[PDB]
Amino acid sequence: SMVRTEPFQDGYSLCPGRELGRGKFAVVRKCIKKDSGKEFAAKFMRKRRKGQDCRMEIIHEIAVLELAQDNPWVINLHEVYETASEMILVLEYAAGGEIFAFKEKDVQRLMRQILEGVHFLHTRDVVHLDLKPQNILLTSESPLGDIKIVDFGLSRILKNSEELREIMGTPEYVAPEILSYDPISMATDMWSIGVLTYVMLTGISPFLGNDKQETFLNISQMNLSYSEEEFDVLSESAVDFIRTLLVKKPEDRATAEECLKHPWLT
Template structure:
């Protein structure tokens, strides 16, 4: 999602350097944040030569489109490698938003050593736009599995493995004072769909740099996933992301958006009043431990929510049926990220050999640009409702304006 808000508030400090394998010494000290939690300095060289000299666009449909950005698949001419090119307009609604794009680049640089965040390859700039060349994730959004029929949807063991990766990625961001602020199924990609690959967190257009001693208040995000403190204009914190992860886990396990109403007003009221259900046939096949995991996150007071690190110690995630990663552990020479769980090392050698032929396919990645989508209704439908499914899905992809400073006071509880 591309930010449209004006930055405001006091300037937080630069993020702490991440403990990454191969990270450049003191690289984060070079980045100085702007007011409103935005970084303003990057290390990546911005190329001014024509993009088409080194890349050709792949024929076919776009990977994604928003109000101010479009993502297309492209091929690097000299290597034939696949990438995702994110074309971002610098001027939006009459305002120069180049620095917001610089911030997004800076956050991607900060997280370049983390296996669960999309990798930035190159940056180009023209008179009207900036082009981010990113990894190509062949599996697409996890949203596709969330709206699939029961037999094709995620199994709980799949959600458990992917959720551990999401939490490890978010934990890394939070330790480096970054809050994503738009975690949702459309912003979590898969390296491969079959076999089910690993996740990549994308779209840092709304992300902010936090400082515990200073407050940041902004209304932003996607309606179904925003935390209560967003609606009441209370300070944003890392706990704001954790609420979204709770909603994300609920959607991945059940295919239902827990707070979704018939319109934004009803959705906001459901969030503010904590109108959420953990019963019904959609929970028949969900373990009690998984439900308890969600309940530790969908808590109204931010200070009472579990942190990413605490979530990784939850009983639901402590035992895993599979390695945490299908591709990263081997490609990194057996080393995992600094927050990878120990159970990744307990996978049997036989299981790794069986998956070895699949890993080459799972290493490629992609990035999709999605602007504040507003999912409609229950995701999984009965046989009786299948006739209207295509119409409903098409509505899900009618992108709305980002949720920025537009919530009337009477909806705040």
């Protein structure tokens, strides 16, 4: 991006009222460009983090935003500002807010949009790695609008399996550990879309336990029975779709392109 060094407040007025989001190194505030009166989401990001220059982390976020700029299901980046301590990402404003039990038909329409966005990220070797309801926005609440994916803070651009074969090294030397390990991959995103699909259709988090250690155990060992009362109104195809995603072994999970061809969305 072309980084502007004139002051942000010269082109934009910050809206009053509750901020949009706040994290350890950044806050998002609704604003209005003085020219158009058009609304935007201004994301103020600190460069310094835990005492060290982390400008490169903001630069990484921008680069993922630009990679996905022709993706209509990812939030648009309008402008970038910079000051002595902050970089400001002027983002597209998604008037609906966060996605959040839905009706099965809404989930079908919205989930197809989400999968197109994710599919096109995977097409570009980007793994989002933080697909959750907080990060899936809507262009309208009533009626339900279109989805916008935000927040590429944990995102990575992943090496091909061929670079994973070279970083592997010669086979007779690899420890049993590495042969048992499952690295983060595109399939990691698809798991999360499985959890999201479950939650949208039923209202229950499938692996939530009484504490955290239980949630972790459920994630690694629980075979979901479905079969709770919330599934009676749901199609068999809806349960099958979830089952293609909540497969413990990552190699065996459906990809975004196969999800888009699944009969639940067709």
